[PDB]
Design a protein around this ligand. Structure first.
Ligand SMILES: CCCCCCCCCCCCCCCCCC(=O)OC[C@H](COP(=O)(O)OCCN)OC(=O)CCCCCCCCCCCCCCCCC
Ligand SMILES: CCCCCCCCCCCCCCCCCC(=O)OC[C@H](COP(=O)(O)OCCN)OC(=O)CCCCCCCCCCCCCCCCC
Ligand SMILES: CCCCCCCCCCCCCCCCCC(=O)OC[C@H](COP(=O)(O)OCCN)OC(=O)CCCCCCCCCCCCCCCCC
Ligand SMILES: CCCCCCCCCCCCCCCCCC(=O)OC[C@H](COP(=O)(O)OCCN)OC(=O)CCCCCCCCCCCCCCCCC
Ligand SMILES: Nc1ncnc2c1ncn2[C@@H]1O[C@H](COP(=O)(O)OP(=O)(O)OP(=O)(O)O)[C@@H](O)[C@H]1O
Lengths: 99, 52, 63, 50, 344, 140, 49, 46, 39, 459, 320, 119
């Protein structure tokens, strides 16, 4: 047979670092890494991200659109016009081909 | 050519005895001197696609 | 900033790109005409040099 | 202390460099600054809109 | 070999192509080719072993026949027009014989069978020259006559070269034969784009040279003429993997790397000329080159092979081989896509 | 004089079946002659008899390929009035691959050639119709 | 779905690889092949013209 | 402490000086060239 | 466990004159390591 | 956009000239800050889209992909940490650099305007993935897996390039929205049909069609967890983005040159959801789940309706998050048992009583439990295909059933039996991986609360 | 500046220094013969240099700080274990033979470069021309396999011919019972477990292959124990020696130059010892290899290149 | 292609017809990228020679950067000249051949009837 090291063996971590957190064997580094994770992902992004996104105004005009639609319905129902026609473009300016 | 170092330095190593209308030693004329002279002089400046 | 900035910036981008497109499609046809007619500055294939022809008497009248 | 804590000047410097290059890009593309058929204003309160 | 002999032989090796490219007279071009041949043979045969002698013999015979055919073409043109330069009036047979001869001089298929044998029998610093510096004069002679060539036979030669290069590199386990078939493929690309745009032939030429020189230097670092020998590079010199892998991917022609641009822009021009079917065939068959380059990237940089013991003493020893050109050319060849509009 | 192979495309498919099959058969024979010359010069044999037998094998094989392809195509165009349909050439290519598999005694080769030659012939016809050019001249 | 696409690709290309790389270093055969090439090219030219 | 005292035990001050001088001269010539080209451009175009 | 790394069985398949030896005419043998044949 | 890309480019030096103890921490924190900054793209107060340059642009369809890409990074950092822990500092810095390069290229190709830039980046995404899968896998078939992945992709991508050139020549640009304001109808000829095939097959391969799905299960099973995550979340989305962007010019061909792919998708959906019932490898099960879910995306792009595209985008993002979550959950066990076999370890939820919840919710999502964006996508795809033809509901219901079956199978054969009491090596749950699962879930809650950021172009 | 074409053109040539006694001599024999003493005395009486026998730590001693290294960093082999338990299923026997051939080759080179740059002749102990006797002995005894033997012969063919042979070969002949007695007296709990069969196989290899093979290209001088220990006879024989029949006369300045380049580049020396022939006795796995290499580079004075390790007192690392 | 044109000087890097174009600025992204490549070449040279990357050969790295920027400036000038010449010739030909470059008769969408395609 040939030269090679033998398969290693499982290694409990809690035996030496019962306060283990998952990141590094060095306890202080483990702790500061988990702290950085929790303070930059949870305490900031999710919180301030949610805040900013929630207070983005008029996302894609879905609010101005409702306001303007109310204005239009009022104008039209008041002046007897209909609320919406069957042709977007006025068929006057258009010039159809004659067969 | 591919690298006009000759024309760059304004010299002549190989481009003076190419064709028949060139300079012969004791002014000896070549056979088709006039025909070739005319062809060249008429194709000068419009090279290739036109001259063909 | 307001939306007018993005609006006008998009308009300028569109201008630039449309100009590029016109120029490319004109380049193709110009190159085609030049390759097929030899009437321009490109694709002017070479010819012999008339400066090396001899224009002196030749020891015989007929050439 | 610097040899281990000077690496905190790169990524924010990168953010600022990015903002600066965006500023350059929009200093370009200046055309149509007020020639849009929708936002043609009259320059009454200022000298440059965008 | 003493300094005087070295100087004379290498000055001739350098002068050959220079005359070829700086001369208007086809006779002087032929002279340059003969210089190249004469001055290359001794370097091939330096080691004086049966394999090198056989390689030299094959090279000599092939190149000499090719030169004779080229000179026949020249003589026929001379009887036909009185001038020593091809014009728009030479019988196309003359030019097709000339193209066959130039293709055998280069190593294109189906005139390629000699290239792998010779390169194998030859050392590394000689394959480098044979595959980079000895492609410049025969390609120049073609660049000078690109308007009056036969696209049909050119494209047939190019596509045959692509195909056979792929189907050779798939099987060869020897560095030098792999390089030979890669040369065949890239020269096929060159010929393909030649009659439409030769600036791109020259582009791909310089790209392939920048990509090949540093690879042969990498090899010469340990004289690893084999896959199982270059696999030990992780224990001998592992600071070369990050660059061997990238240069091989560039050769293969992977998008984000210099080596891509040649294929891309050549395909563009062929599309403008309605050579889309040929461009498609070539682009699909380059993936085999990419395949047998990935198979080497694996054995070199993405998995460790069974090593040896005396490699320990090899580690003990120091080294001063890889001069600055290695790094310079590898960087220029791997990280220069953002500058493609200038190289075009 | 090269018009033997141009008489194939002077009439819609479904006509002149006999001469069309003759043309495809000549094409097969030529391709086989070239292949056999190459395989005889490289990778040669022992006896000139075995060599000429290799030649005959390859030539008759390719000739059968071409004959079956052309005949099946024109027969499909006959039984169905569709002279501008690449499906006929696909069927012909599959028949050619079938004949190749019958000769070489390999269902693998049979189906592989079927698919490949079918695509090849269909794309050939598509080019003929649309206006594709193979080996075109420079225009940039 | 393995037998069809990838295994077929591999088989095809390995077989053509063997074909094209079954070469023995015989200059006679290489040059006979070169001669076949010359003949084919001359014929293409003289035929199409 | 080694036993084969190498070539690199101390720096090549000639190479150092030449490199630094070449760099400084490159930058000086580059600045001068750029400024001169700008001056010529503006002379030609107004 | 741990990362599997090639063994002799996996590395000796790159050691023949040519890969994919599906041929029966490929009686060849690896060339020398110094290009000096045996005699 | 450059304020998003330059810092991602600077994460590299940080990584290399950071000390061997603070590189993970620093790069993860700054990656989180990048994810944060990427939310500028969500400031869309008008129906006009963003255009920062001639080279970059953002849309309601590219913004979510970009933010998910910038969010997944620190999660992959955290997940690739327990393994390659003993590996050398240099090797793990290499790993981090690979991850960062993937991030940058994916952001670029989502923010791109030109199809050819999109192409070079969608094809440069191969190098880091191949390297991660081959240099850090544990089996011996990762090499063949990389071969399959690489070459499927390239074989699909070449004709796309050729079609892009043909277009760049006919039209004078490959620029988006110009290809829109100038698009013409076509002639319904065979050349244009082959143009369609070319433009499409690349993306139909990068998101596995039924018949060419034979690179995803391999790559997953043989790849590490970060590779698995990115492959499941974004690399399967490049195809969707590309098709949603390229289908605008191929009109009106997809009305009839799309049937085969709709059929293959609606059938392979069933034929993979069923494999998810009798596969033994948890990772391959989840891979086939990804396939059965991307089939819907394909069939919904094919029919070109607003509801269809909306559902496609919703399901894209939702499946990204959920698949990453499930992969990390299986990895938590693998790290403890070194076997992907599902029926080996059982009776959990006794020693890991909390991770049994994450296991459960990731399953509630995959089987489309309302209210959820998985369902808000599936439902609209179903409605669009029912308007297309009412007989699709049959196959949709069959797939729904099989999904509800194999999700709970995966739950019960791992967490809801009785324990394999002979398992001494069940190290308790790490805060790190619990945080992974929480970071995966919470954004799903938030996107279920505000699914206006996830509809897409139409809405 | 380094030696090369330029130095050889400028005047750093060879033939300007080949004074008589610019030779290379070997003092071979059996194991416990007076080789060290005789060779030191010859070196003194002829002004030449002495290169002692090369073992498992020759490279560790010639490179770096000069101190030895763990056996896993230099050799992974043990002569003690070879004498204690041959036939082992580990591979120590051939894994030791190969490393010792490599070290003897490195030593031959380190001596040739010294002899060519400086005319000071050299005297060595058993060399690459005689290492094979200890291999043939093990093969005839059953400690090694024909595969290992063929691997050894192949590396020998690849390496040896590129080197010049010795001028004078002194063979100190001694019989196996006297050798065993000398071993018991000297005292070594492991050497004292060796076998007269092995010793006689060594002697027979010597007399039947080495002497014939070498008397045709270098002057042989065979002596016994009592002619030895009276060295002046040996030294005067050498001084009288005629130096024909060798290739050293076919050599000019430029052959010497192209040999000095090889001998100076210590990696083209071992490229062929490092061939990937996969013997289970030397084939090291990737994990073991990587661990050993990374630890070797972790060690001091070995991480970076010689003039670039500050932890050992290297300054100016920012300008060289 | 553009070699054989009137007013063509052989083997010249930069004629005087190019001194009228605006020169590139040293802050140009391409020059900066060439500087980056120089620095990376230095670092790779060290990494291959087994020296401390980023802590060795400062003069070497400086030389690399300087040479790269130097070559880039001039090569960029040249390529800009070439592109300008290309546009020049193209527009000149367009102006001398008005018979093959006619202004399109661009209509308005109110007249041309484009076909409609449901779903
Ligand atoms: C788009 C990018 C995609 C990439 C994903 C990765 C994201 C990583 C970045 C971090 C996340 C950044 C922000 C995520 C979006 C946050 C949305 C938000 O801010 O909430 C807005 C909402 C008010 O919504 P608004 O639009 O202002 O008014 C109209 C009605 N929506 O106001 C709120 O509701 C906020 C209050 C939250 C309270 C949560 C209560 C939970 C209720 C339980 C619901 C359970 C439903 C799910 C159950 C099944 C799930 C399995
Ligand atoms: C931004 C846009 C993105 C555009 C697309 C980007 C394309 C993808 C980028 C690919 C770059 C890397 C590709 C090549 C992979 C190289 C594989 C490799 O080098 O790692 C293997 C090897 C491990 O060696 P080993 O013996 O196992 O132990 C460590 C001892 N060095 O490693 C080595 O031994 C290396 C040599 C050791 C030298 C000392 C360490 C110095 C660092 C050298 C590595 C530098 C890598 C730079 C990575 C930058 C990534 C962008
Ligand atoms: C201690 C941890 C620190 C983390 C931050 C804590 C506060 C929470 C903030 C999160 C909410 C904001 C997230 C979105 C930020 C994107 C907005 C933005 O950056 O705007 C760009 C702005 C540059 O503005 P500009 O107009 O381009 O130039 C004028 C210069 N006065 O540039 C800026 O205004 C810079 C914004 C900083 C982003 C971080
Ligand atoms: C294991 C799988 C097999 C792997 C081996 C692959 C073998 C490659 C196939 C052999 C080559 C056959 C293709 C030849 C291309 C012919 C040219 C063509 O089809 O282009 C036509 C079209 C543009 O035409 P149009 O614009 O209308 O006008 C005329 C041109 N100006 O432009 C186009 O349509 C571009 C067409 C490009 C080629 C498309 C190939 C088929 C696409 C669908 C399948 C893609 C998967 C890979 C190929 C599978 C086998 C075909
Ligand atoms: N190639 C080899 N294989 C096995 N053993 C070897 C080899 N080379 C040397 N040895 C061992 O090295 C030892 C050399 O001891 P030796 O008696 O030569 O000491 P010494 O210092 O040379 O003294 P002296 O010169 O008087 O003999 C022997 O026991 C021998 O077995």
């Amino acid at each position: 047979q040939w030269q090679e090291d033998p398969e290693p063996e499982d290694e409990n971590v809690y035996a030496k670092n019962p306060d283990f957190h998952g990141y590094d064997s060095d306890p202080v580094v483990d702790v500061w890494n988990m702290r950085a994770v929790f303070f930059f992902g949870f305490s900031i992004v999710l919180v301030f991200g949610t805040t900013f996104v929630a207070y983005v105004p008029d996302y894609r005009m879905q609010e101005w659109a409702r306001r303007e639609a109310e204005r239009l319905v009022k104008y039209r129902e008041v002046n007897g016009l209909p609320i919406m026609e069957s042709n977007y473009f006025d068929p006057s300016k258009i010039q159809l081909p004659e067969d | 050519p591919f690298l006009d170092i000759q024309k760059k330095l304004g010299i002549s190593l190989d481009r003076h005895f190419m064709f028949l209308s060139a300079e012969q030693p004791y002014k000896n004329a070549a056979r088709c001197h006039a025909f070739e002279k005319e062809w060249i002089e008429c194709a000068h400046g419009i090279g290739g696609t036109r001259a063909k | 900033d307001g939306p007018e900035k993005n609006y006008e910036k998009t308009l300028a981008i569109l201008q630039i790109e449309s100009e590029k497109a016109e120029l490319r499609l004109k380049e193709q046809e110009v190159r085609r005409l030049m390759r097929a007619r030899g009437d321009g500055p490109w694709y002017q294939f070479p010819t012999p040099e008339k400066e090396f022809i001899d224009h002196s008497p030749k020891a015989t009248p007929d050439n | 202390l610097l040899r281990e804590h000077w690496v905190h000047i790169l990524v924010p410097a990168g953010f600022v460099f990015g903002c600066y290059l965006d500023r350059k890009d929009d200093e370009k593309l200046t055309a149509f600054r007020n020639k849009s058929m929708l936002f043609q204003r009259e320059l009454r309160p200022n000298e440059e809109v965008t | 070999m003493n300094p005087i002999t070295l100087a004379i032989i290498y000055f001739t090796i350098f002068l050959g192509p220079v005359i070829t490219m700086s001369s208007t007279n086809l006779m002087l071009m032929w002279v340059g080719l003969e210089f190249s041949l004469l001055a290359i043979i001794p370097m091939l045969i330096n080691k004086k072993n049966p394999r090198s002698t056989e390689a030299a013999t094959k090279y000599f015979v092939t190149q000499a026949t090719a030169s004779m055919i080229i000179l026949l073409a020249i003589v026929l043109n001379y009887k036909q027009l009185g001038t020593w330069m091809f014009q728009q009036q030479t019988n196309g047979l003359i030019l097709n014989m000339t193209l066959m001869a130039l293709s055998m001089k280069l190593g294109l298929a189906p005139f390629h069978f000699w290239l792998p044998e010779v390169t194998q029998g030859i050392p590394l610093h000689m394959g480098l020259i044979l595959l980079t510096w000895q492609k410049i004069a025969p390609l120049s002679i073609l660049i000078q006559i690109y308007p009056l060539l036969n696209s049909t036979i050119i494209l047939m030669l190019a596509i045959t070269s692509i195909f056979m290069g792929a189907w050779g590199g798939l099987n060869q386990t020897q560095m030098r034969k792999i390089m030979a078939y890669s040369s065949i493929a890239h020269m096929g690309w060159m010929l393909a784009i030649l009659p439409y745009n030769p600036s791109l032939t020259l582009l791909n030429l310089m790209i392939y040279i920048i990509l090949t020189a540093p690879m042969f230097m990498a090899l010469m670092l340990n004289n690893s003429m084999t896959i199982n020998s270059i696999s030990l590079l992780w224990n001998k010199t592992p600071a070369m993997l990050t660059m061997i892998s990238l240069m091989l991917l560039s050769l293969g022609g992977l998008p984000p790397l210099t080596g891509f641009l040649p294929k891309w822009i050549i395909i563009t021009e062929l599309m403008k000329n309605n050579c889309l079917i040929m461009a498609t065939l070539m682009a699909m068959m380059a993936l085999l080159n990419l395949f047998f380059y990935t198979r080497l990237i694996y054995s070199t940089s993405l998995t460790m092979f069974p090593t040896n013991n005396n490699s320990k003493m090899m580690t003990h020893q120091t080294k001063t081989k890889p001069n600055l050109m290695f790094s310079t050319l590898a960087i220029m060849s791997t990280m220069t896509l953002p500058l493609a509009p200038q190289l075009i | 004089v090269k018009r033997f192979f141009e008489s194939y495309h002077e009439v819609p498919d479904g006509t002149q079946c006999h001469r069309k099959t003759y043309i495809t058969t000549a094409l097969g024979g030529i391709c086989g002659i070239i292949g056999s010359a190459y395989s005889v010069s490289l990778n040669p044999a022992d006896s000139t008899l075995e060599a000429v037998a290799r030649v005959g094998r390859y030539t008759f094989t390719a000739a059968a390929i071409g004959a079956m392809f052309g005949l099946t195509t024109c027969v499909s165009a006959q039984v169905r009035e569709k002279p501008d349909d690449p499906l006929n050439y696909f069927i012909g290519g599959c028949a050619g691959g079938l004949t190749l598999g019958a000769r070489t005694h390999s269902y693998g080769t049979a189906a592989m050639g079927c698919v490949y030659m079918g695509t090849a012939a269909a794309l050939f016809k598509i080019g003929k119709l649309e206006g594709w050019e193979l080996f075109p001249t420079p225009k940039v | 779905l393995e037998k069809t696409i990838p295994k077929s690709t591999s088989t095809l290309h390995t077989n053509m690889t063997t074909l094209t790389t079954n070469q023995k270093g015989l200059i006679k055969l290489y040059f006979m092949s070169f001669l076949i090439n010359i003949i084919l090219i001359i014929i293409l030219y003289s035929i199409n013209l | 402490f080694y036993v084969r005292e190498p070539v690199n035990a101390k720096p090549n001050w000639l190479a150092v000086g030449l490199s630094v001088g070449a760099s400084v001269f490159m930058w000086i010539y580059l600045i001068q060239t750029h400024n001169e080209d700008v001056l010529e451009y503006k002379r030609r175009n107004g | 466990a741990r990362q599997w790394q090639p063994d002799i069985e996996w590395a000796e398949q790159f050691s023949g004159a040519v890969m994919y030896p599906s041929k029966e005419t490929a009686h060849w043998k690896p060339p020398p390591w110094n290009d000096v044949d045996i005699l | 956009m450059l304020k998003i890309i330059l810092p991602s480019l600077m994460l590299l030096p940080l990584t290399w000239l950071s000390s061997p103890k603070k590189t993970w921490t620093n790069v993860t924190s700054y990656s989180f800050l990048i994810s944060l900054t990427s939310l500028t793209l969500l400031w869309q107060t008008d129906e006009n889209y963003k255009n920062f340059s001639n080279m970059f642009s953002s849309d309601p369809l590219s913004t979510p992909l970009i933010i998910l890409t910038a969010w997944l990074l620190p999660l992959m950092l955290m997940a690739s940490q327990n393994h390659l822990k003993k590996d050398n500092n240099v090797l793990q810095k290499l790993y981090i650099s690979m991850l960062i390069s993937l991030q940058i290229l994916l952001i670029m190709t989502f923010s791109a305007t030109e199809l050819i830039m999109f192409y070079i980046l969608f094809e440069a995404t191969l190098i880091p993935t191949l390297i991660i899968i081959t240099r850090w896998g544990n089996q011996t078939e990762r090499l063949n897996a990389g071969i399959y992945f690489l070459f499927y992709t390239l074989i699909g991508s070449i004709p796309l390039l050729i079609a892009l050139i043909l277009i760049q020549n006919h039209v004078g640009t490959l620029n988006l929205m110009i290809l829109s304001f100038t698009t013409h109808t076509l002639d319904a000829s065979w050349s244009n049909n082959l143009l369609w095939l070319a433009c499409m097959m690349a993306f139909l391969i990068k998101m596995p069609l039924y018949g060419v799905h034979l690179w995803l299960p391999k790559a997953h099973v043989e790849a590490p967890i970060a590779g698995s995550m990115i492959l499941a979340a974004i690399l399967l989305k490049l195809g969707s983005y590309g098709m949603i962007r390229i289908s605008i010019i191929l009109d009106p061909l997809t009305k009839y040159m799309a049937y085969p792919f709709i059929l293959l998708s609606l059938w392979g959906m069933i034929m993979t959801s069923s494999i998810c019932l009798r596969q033994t490898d948890l990772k391959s099960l989840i891979a086939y789940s990804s396939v059965s879910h991307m089939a819907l995306v394909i069939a919904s792009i094919m029919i070109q309706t607003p509801w269809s595209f909306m559902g496609a985008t919703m399901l894209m993002i939702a499946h990204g998050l959920t698949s990453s979550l499930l992969f990390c959950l299986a990895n938590s066990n693998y790290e403890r048992i070194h076997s992907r076999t599902m029926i080996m370890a059982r009776g959990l939820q006794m020693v890991f009583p909390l991770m049994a919840t994450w296991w459960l919710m990731a399953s509630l999502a995959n089987l489309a439990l309302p209210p959820s964006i998985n369902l808000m996508g599936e439902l609209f795809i179903t409605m669009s295909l029912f308007s297309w033809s009412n007989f699709t509901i049959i196959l949709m219901g069959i797939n729904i059933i099989i999904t509800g079956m194999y999700s709970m199978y995966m739950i019960i054969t791992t967490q809801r039996g009785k324990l394999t009491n002979h398992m001494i090596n069940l190290q308790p749950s790490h805060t790190r991986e619990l945080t992974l699962m929480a970071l995966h879930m919470i954004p799903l809650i938030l996107l279920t609360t505000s699914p206006k950021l996830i509809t897409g172009l139409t809405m | 500046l380094r030696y090369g074409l330029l130095a050889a053109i400028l005047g750093d040539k060879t033939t300007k220094k080949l004074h008589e006694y610019s030779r290379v001599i070997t003092v071979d024999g059996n194991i416990c013969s007076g080789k060290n003493k005789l060779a030191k005395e010859i070196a003194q009486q002829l002004g030449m240099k002495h290169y002692p026998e090369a073992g498992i730590q020759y490279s560790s001693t010639t490179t770096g700080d000069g101190r030895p290294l763990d056996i896993e960093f230099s050799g992974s082999c043990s002569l003690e274990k070879f004498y204690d338990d041959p036939k082992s299923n580990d591979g120590n026997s051939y894994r030791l033979q190969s490393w010792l051939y490599a070290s003897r080759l490195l030593q031959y080179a380190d001596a040739l470069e010294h002899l060519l740059s400086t005319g000071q002749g050299v005297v060595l102990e058993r060399s690459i021309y005689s290492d094979f006797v200890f291999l043939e002995a093990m093969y005839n005894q059953g400690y090694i396999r024909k595969q290992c033997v063929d691997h050894y012969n192949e590396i020998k063919r690849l390496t040896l011919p590129e080197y010049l042979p010795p001028h004078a070969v002194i063979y100190i002949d001694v019989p196996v019972p006297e050798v065993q007695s000398r071993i018991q007296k000297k005292g070594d709990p492991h050497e004292m477990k060796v076998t007269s069969a092995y010793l006689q196989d060594i002697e027979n290899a010597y007399k039947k292959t080495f002497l014939p093979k070498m008397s045709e290209m270098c002057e042989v001088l065979v002596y016994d124990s009592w002619e030895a220990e009276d060295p002046t006879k040996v030294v005067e024989d050498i001084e009288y020696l005629k130096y024909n029949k060798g290739p050293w006369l076919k050599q000019d300045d430029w052959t010497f130059h192209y040999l000095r380049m090889l001998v100076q580049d210590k990696t083209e020396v071992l490229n062929y010892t490092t061939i990937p022939v996969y013997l289970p006795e030397i084939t090291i796995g990737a994990h073991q290899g990587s661990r050993i290499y990374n630890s070797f580079r972790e060690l001091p004075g070995r991480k970076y290149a010689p003039g670039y390790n500050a932890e050992v007192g290297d300054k100016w690392i920012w300008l060289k | 292609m553009m070699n054989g044109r009137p007013g063509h000087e052989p083997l010249k890097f930069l004629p005087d017809e190019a001194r009228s174009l605006p020169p590139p600025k040293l802050n140009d992204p391409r020059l900066v990228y060439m500087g980056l490549l120089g620095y990376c070449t230095g670092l790779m040279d060290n990494m291959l020679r087994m020296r401390p990357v980023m802590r060795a050969g400062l003069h070497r790295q400086l030389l690399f950067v300087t040479s790269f920027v130097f070559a880039g400036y001039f090569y960029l000038k040249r390529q800009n000249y070439l592109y300008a010449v290309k546009d020049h010739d193209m527009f000149g030909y367009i102006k001398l051949h008005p018979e093959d470059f006619p202004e399109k008769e661009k209509k308005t969408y109110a007249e041309i009837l484009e076909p409609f395609h449901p779903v």
